[PDB]
Design a protein around this ligand. Structure first.
Ligand SMILES: CC(=O)N[C@H]1[C@H](O[C@H]2[C@@H](O)[C@@H](CO)O[C@@H](O[C@H]3[C@H](O)[C@@H](O)[C@H](O)O[C@@H]3CO)[C@@H]2O)O[C@H](CO)[C@@H](O[C@@H]2O[C@H](CO)[C@H](O)[C@H](O)[C@H]2O)[C@@H]1O
Ligand SMILES: [Cl-]
Length: 138
């Protein structure tokens, strides 16, 4: 069981056909989870399940550039459940990150950061027991 927050190096950044797989279990009474794909200090792709934003569950995605958040993209489909094991798969495609949870497609997030080969860390944080984090080329 990995320590959270957890940093997964992505050597040489990301590239299309790279698949990143995160396995974990959501804590009971979770508040948040975040996956941050980072280019140095910038966050190219922030993937942020929120379990109680005004008593609603929502996924917030965004990009942080020079310490400024951009326009949020919001998804009301919410596949996570407190207490339950999950699998997040992030497939890098040419124009977007494609995210599936528990083998069901969830969302896509268009690339705002263009230097994909400089997105060289994944930060995993929030209210989970983290089991594993890895990548493979498909
Ligand atoms: C307070 C908090 O949760 N801070 C987090 C940071 O959250 C921010 C992020 O989710 C952005 C995405 O757009 O939204 C921010 O909230 C906005 C509301 O959505 C919006 O309705 C309102 O008008 O404006 C709000 C603020 O703009 C939200 O605060 O997310 C970052 C990245 O995950 C967190 O930083 C990381 O924290 C981890 C540990 O959790 C480590 O410290 C990492 O090093 C660090 O990058 C930040 O803590
Ligand atoms: Cl860029």
């Amino acid at each position: 069981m990995l320590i959270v927050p957890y940093n997964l190096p992505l050597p040489g950044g990301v590239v299309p056909r790279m698949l990143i797989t995160i396995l974990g279990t959501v804590k009971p009474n979770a508040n948040r989870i975040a996956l941050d794909f980072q280019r140095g200090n910038d966050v190219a792709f922030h993937f942020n399940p929120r379990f109680n934003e005004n008593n609603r569950r929502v996924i917030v995605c965004n990009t942080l550039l020079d310490n400024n958040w951009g326009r949020e993209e919001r998804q009301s489909v919410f596949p996570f459940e407190s207490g339950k094991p999950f699998k997040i798969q992030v497939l890098v495609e040419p124009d977007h990150f494609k995210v599936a949870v528990n083998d069901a497609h969830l969302l896509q997030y268009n690339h705002r950061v263009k230097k994909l080969n400089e997105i060289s860390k994944l930060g995993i944080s929030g209210d989970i027991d983290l089991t594993s984090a890895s990548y493979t080329m498909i």
